[PDB]
Design an enzyme around this catalytic site. Structure first.
Site, PDB file in Angstrom:
ATOM      1  N   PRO A  25       0.858  -1.188   0.000  1.00  0.00           N
ATOM      2  CA  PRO A  25       0.000   0.000   0.000  1.00  0.00           C
ATOM      3  C   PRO A  25       0.896   1.241   0.000  1.00  0.00           C
ATOM      4  O   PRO A  25       1.885   1.312   0.751  1.00  0.00           O
ATOM      5  CB  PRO A  25      -0.757  -0.119   1.331  1.00  0.00           C
ATOM      6  CG  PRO A  25       0.160  -0.936   2.201  1.00  0.00           C
ATOM      7  CD  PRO A  25       0.660  -1.995   1.224  1.00  0.00           C
ATOM      8  N   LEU A  26       0.573   2.196  -0.840  1.00  0.00           N
ATOM      9  CA  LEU A  26       1.473   3.289  -1.067  1.00  0.00           C
ATOM     10  C   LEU A  26       0.680   4.546  -1.272  1.00  0.00           C
ATOM     11  O   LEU A  26       0.104   4.755  -2.338  1.00  0.00           O
ATOM     12  CB  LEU A  26       2.374   3.014  -2.284  1.00  0.00           C
ATOM     13  CG  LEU A  26       3.399   1.879  -2.107  1.00  0.00           C
ATOM     14  CD1 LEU A  26       3.743   1.247  -3.484  1.00  0.00           C
ATOM     15  CD2 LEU A  26       4.636   2.255  -1.279  1.00  0.00           C
ATOM     16  N   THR A  27       0.692   5.380  -0.242  1.00  0.00           N
ATOM     17  CA  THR A  27       0.132   6.722  -0.281  1.00  0.00           C
ATOM     18  C   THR A  27       0.865   7.625  -1.264  1.00  0.00           C
ATOM     19  O   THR A  27       2.080   7.868  -1.112  1.00  0.00           O
ATOM     20  CB  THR A  27       0.248   7.344   1.091  1.00  0.00           C
ATOM     21  OG1 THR A  27      -0.559   6.586   1.998  1.00  0.00           O
ATOM     22  CG2 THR A  27      -0.212   8.847   1.064  1.00  0.00           C
ATOM     23  N   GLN A 102      -6.696  -0.688   1.357  1.00  0.00           N
ATOM     24  CA  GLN A 102      -6.283  -0.515   2.758  1.00  0.00           C
ATOM     25  C   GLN A 102      -7.152   0.597   3.417  1.00  0.00           C
ATOM     26  O   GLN A 102      -7.346   1.641   2.825  1.00  0.00           O
ATOM     27  CB  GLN A 102      -4.797  -0.184   2.870  1.00  0.00           C
ATOM     28  CG  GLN A 102      -4.300  -0.215   4.317  1.00  0.00           C
ATOM     29  CD  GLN A 102      -2.882   0.303   4.433  1.00  0.00           C
ATOM     30  OE1 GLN A 102      -2.584   1.397   3.983  1.00  0.00           O
ATOM     31  NE2 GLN A 102      -1.982  -0.506   5.025  1.00  0.00           N
ATOM     32  N   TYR A 199      -0.347   4.618  13.104  1.00  0.00           N
ATOM     33  CA  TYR A 199      -1.741   5.099  12.963  1.00  0.00           C
ATOM     34  C   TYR A 199      -2.680   4.577  14.042  1.00  0.00           C
ATOM     35  O   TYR A 199      -2.196   4.021  15.029  1.00  0.00           O
ATOM     36  CB  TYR A 199      -2.250   5.031  11.509  1.00  0.00           C
ATOM     37  CG  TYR A 199      -1.273   5.803  10.626  1.00  0.00           C
ATOM     38  CD1 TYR A 199      -0.390   5.135   9.766  1.00  0.00           C
ATOM     39  CD2 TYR A 199      -1.155   7.196  10.746  1.00  0.00           C
ATOM     40  CE1 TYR A 199       0.535   5.837   9.001  1.00  0.00           C
ATOM     41  CE2 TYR A 199      -0.225   7.921   9.980  1.00  0.00           C
ATOM     42  CZ  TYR A 199       0.626   7.233   9.120  1.00  0.00           C
ATOM     43  OH  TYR A 199       1.558   7.943   8.394  1.00  0.00           O
ATOM     44  N   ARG A 248      -2.573  -5.581   8.359  1.00  0.00           N
ATOM     45  CA  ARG A 248      -1.169  -5.187   8.338  1.00  0.00           C
ATOM     46  C   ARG A 248      -0.723  -4.678   9.701  1.00  0.00           C
ATOM     47  O   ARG A 248      -1.430  -3.867  10.338  1.00  0.00           O
ATOM     48  CB  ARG A 248      -0.914  -4.045   7.327  1.00  0.00           C
ATOM     49  CG  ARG A 248       0.558  -3.935   7.000  1.00  0.00           C
ATOM     50  CD  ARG A 248       0.868  -2.929   5.907  1.00  0.00           C
ATOM     51  NE  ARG A 248       2.048  -3.351   5.114  1.00  0.00           N
ATOM     52  CZ  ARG A 248       2.836  -2.483   4.470  1.00  0.00           C
ATOM     53  NH1 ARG A 248       2.566  -1.193   4.580  1.00  0.00           N
ATOM     54  NH2 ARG A 248       3.875  -2.877   3.719  1.00  0.00           N
ATOM     55  N   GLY A 335       7.256  -2.263  -1.994  1.00  0.00           N
ATOM     56  CA  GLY A 335       6.842  -0.856  -2.060  1.00  0.00           C
ATOM     57  C   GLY A 335       7.545  -0.050  -3.135  1.00  0.00           C
ATOM     58  O   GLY A 335       7.014   0.115  -4.204  1.00  0.00           O
TER      59      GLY A 335
HETATM   60  C1  LIG Z   1       5.604   6.953  -0.615  1.00  0.00           C
HETATM   61  C2  LIG Z   1       5.261   5.841   0.332  1.00  0.00           C
HETATM   62  C3  LIG Z   1       3.938   5.693   0.689  1.00  0.00           C
HETATM   63  C4  LIG Z   1       3.585   4.670   1.586  1.00  0.00           C
HETATM   64  N1  LIG Z   1       2.277   4.505   1.948  1.00  0.00           N
HETATM   65  C5  LIG Z   1       1.867   3.514   2.773  1.00  0.00           C
HETATM   66  C6  LIG Z   1       0.447   3.318   3.130  1.00  0.00           C
HETATM   67  O1  LIG Z   1      -0.388   4.092   2.601  1.00  0.00           O
HETATM   68  N2  LIG Z   1       0.117   2.322   3.951  1.00  0.00           N
HETATM   69  C7  LIG Z   1       1.058   1.456   4.447  1.00  0.00           C
HETATM   70  O2  LIG Z   1       0.763   0.498   5.209  1.00  0.00           O
HETATM   71  N3  LIG Z   1       2.377   1.609   4.190  1.00  0.00           N
HETATM   72  C8  LIG Z   1       2.824   2.577   3.329  1.00  0.00           C
HETATM   73  N4  LIG Z   1       4.173   2.713   3.004  1.00  0.00           N
HETATM   74  C9  LIG Z   1       5.076   1.688   3.527  1.00  0.00           C
HETATM   75  C10 LIG Z   1       5.160   0.684   2.322  1.00  0.00           C
HETATM   76  O3  LIG Z   1       3.912  -0.017   2.153  1.00  0.00           O
HETATM   77  C11 LIG Z   1       6.313  -0.329   2.471  1.00  0.00           C
HETATM   78  O4  LIG Z   1       6.050  -1.034   3.694  1.00  0.00           O
HETATM   79  C12 LIG Z   1       7.668   0.403   2.557  1.00  0.00           C
HETATM   80  O5  LIG Z   1       7.951   1.087   1.330  1.00  0.00           O
HETATM   81  C13 LIG Z   1       8.836  -0.542   2.773  1.00  0.00           C
HETATM   82  O6  LIG Z   1       8.778  -1.440   1.645  1.00  0.00           O
HETATM   83  P1  LIG Z   1       9.909  -1.419   0.515  1.00  0.00           P
HETATM   84  O7  LIG Z   1      11.230  -1.592   1.217  1.00  0.00           O
HETATM   85  O8  LIG Z   1       9.611  -2.572  -0.383  1.00  0.00           O
HETATM   86  O9  LIG Z   1       9.695  -0.141  -0.242  1.00  0.00           O
HETATM   87  C14 LIG Z   1       4.591   3.723   2.092  1.00  0.00           C
HETATM   88  C15 LIG Z   1       5.948   3.884   1.724  1.00  0.00           C
HETATM   89  C16 LIG Z   1       6.300   4.928   0.871  1.00  0.00           C
HETATM   90  C17 LIG Z   1       7.755   5.062   0.456  1.00  0.00           C
END
Ligand SMILES: Cc1cc2nc3c(=O)[nH]c(=O)nc-3n(C[C@H](O)[C@H](O)[C@H](O)COP(=O)(O)O)c2cc1C
Length: 377
Positions: A25-27, A102, A199, A248, A335
């Site tokens: 999930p990525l904001t 999410q 959160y 999560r 992510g």
């Molecule tokens: C720009 C950005 C937005 C993110 N948004 C969320 C989110 O909305 N919800 C969530 O649980 N985690 C969020 N994360 C955490 C990611 O889901 C992921 O756990 C984190 O990038 C580490 O994974 P990676 O090493 O593969 O990038 C975000 C991370 C980044 C960099």
């Protein structure tokens, strides 16, 4: 085959994923500031381009009206929101992909200058207020400039401690309605409960942010700290079916000064507690983004949870593959690599080189750093 264990199908709830490469999930903040409506034009392209993923977990989406942590994130509470999401989900499904939404409550990480400026008056007793498990503001961290109301860094506010009655009868039904909206109306395949990353739910779960002295959500025991995560997930499962619900958590993630003094015992208990729910999966950050707290979250979950295990955080294809082959995890969510590679699954499949992520453009609110990362070809 390049990464045979990682590319193999997986039974998850009522679905069979095509492969174990999960999109985290990525904001990305591409909704309107006013009604938190998805900007279909960009978000449809973004997700549809990534529909080869085993499963997409769509970004944290609000359950409580106007309770914004990210300034321009989407909601799933209004009819306007549901209509734009339905178009986005249809496009993923057209490519044969699967998508869970999410669901989030920002808790004490709500933006004060937005939330506190809806007037404090009824029709909604939760509106106009910063809410959390305890009146313990986030300390020595500022709201990042890319989330702040002004566009310049801001101070987190002092939240109100939720009553037991507001949790049960105010917060839980918003998750339930949010999930019914997601699934029954917008056509989402499932929902992921946001129990991580400082959160609302994580704030009840870990010691540092939950000092409640009494009641079913007290901070004083591991089981009562687990209870909000439990009650939300259970009420959601009852309304939508457990086979369409993920959870999560991030038991080691130090964002906002979050810390528990016994993360291994907390995690293991959570696992046993949510076992009877028969969730679609449990998804966890295996570590700390800051690299400070250490613990083998992967082994804790493997030893105490028998459903589907999705891990995340600084994985590459080879590590993911071998953790699955060793039976440690069942799938891995990526992510940054999905931000940068809409055809990440294809690149795994042909071991093609990967685009590099550009963190500096993660939150532009434009096509720049959002829809301009090319496919390999
Ligand atoms: C720009 C950005 C937005 C993110 N948004 C969320 C989110 O909305 N919800 C969530 O649980 N985690 C969020 N994360 C955490 C990611 O889901 C992921 O756990 C984190 O990038 C580490 O994974 P990676 O090493 O593969 O990038 C975000 C991370 C980044 C960099």
């Amino acid at each position: 085959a390049t990464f045979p264990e990682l590319l193999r199908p997986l039974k998850l709830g009522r679905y069979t994923l095509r492969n174990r490469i999960i999109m985290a999930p990525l904001t990305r903040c591409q909704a309107t500031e006013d009604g938190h409506v998805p900007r279909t034009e960009s978000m449809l392209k973004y997700y549809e381009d990534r529909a080869s993923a085993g499963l997409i977990i769509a970004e944290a989406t609000m359950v409580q009206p106007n309770y914004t942590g990210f300034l321009t994130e989407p909601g799933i509470y209004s009819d306007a929101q549901i209509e734009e999401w339905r178009k986005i989900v249809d496009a993923v499904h057209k490519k044969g992909g699967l998508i869970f939404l999410q669901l989030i409550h920002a808790g004490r990480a709500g933006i004060p200058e937005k939330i506190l400026q809806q007037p404090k008056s009824d029709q909604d007793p939760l509106a106009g207020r910063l809410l959390a498990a305890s009146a313990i503001p986030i300390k020595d961290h500022r709201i990042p400039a890319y989330f702040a109301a002004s566009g310049e860094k801001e101070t987190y506010g002092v939240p109100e401690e939720l009553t037991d009655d507001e949790v049960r009868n105010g917060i839980i039904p918003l998750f339930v309605e949010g999930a019914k909206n997601a699934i029954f109306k917008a056509g989402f395949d499932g929902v992921e409960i946001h129990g991580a990353n400082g959160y609302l739910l994580d704030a009840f779960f870990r010691e540092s942010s939950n000092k409640r002295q009494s009641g079913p959500y007290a901070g004083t025991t591991i089981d009562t700290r687990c209870q909000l995560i439990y009650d939300v997930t259970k009420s959601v499962c009852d309304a939508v079916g457990s086979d369409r619900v993920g959870l999560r958590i991030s038991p080691l993630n130090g964002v906002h000064g979050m810390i528990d003094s016994n993360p291994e015992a907390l995690t293991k208990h959570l696992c046993k507690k949510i076992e009877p729910l028969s969730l679609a999966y449990l998804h966890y950050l295996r570590g700390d983004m800051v690299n400070q707290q250490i613990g083998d979250v992967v082994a804790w979950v493997r030893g105490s949870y028998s459903g589907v295990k999705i891990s995340n955080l600084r994985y590459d294809f080879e590590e993911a593959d071998q953790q699955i082959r060793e039976g440690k995890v069942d799938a891995v969510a990526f992510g940054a690599k999905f931000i940068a590679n809409p055809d990440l699954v294809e690149r795994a499949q042909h071991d093609w080189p990967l685009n590099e992520p550009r963190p500096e453009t993660y939150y532009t609110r434009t096509a720049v750093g959002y829809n301009d990362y090319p496919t390999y070809n």
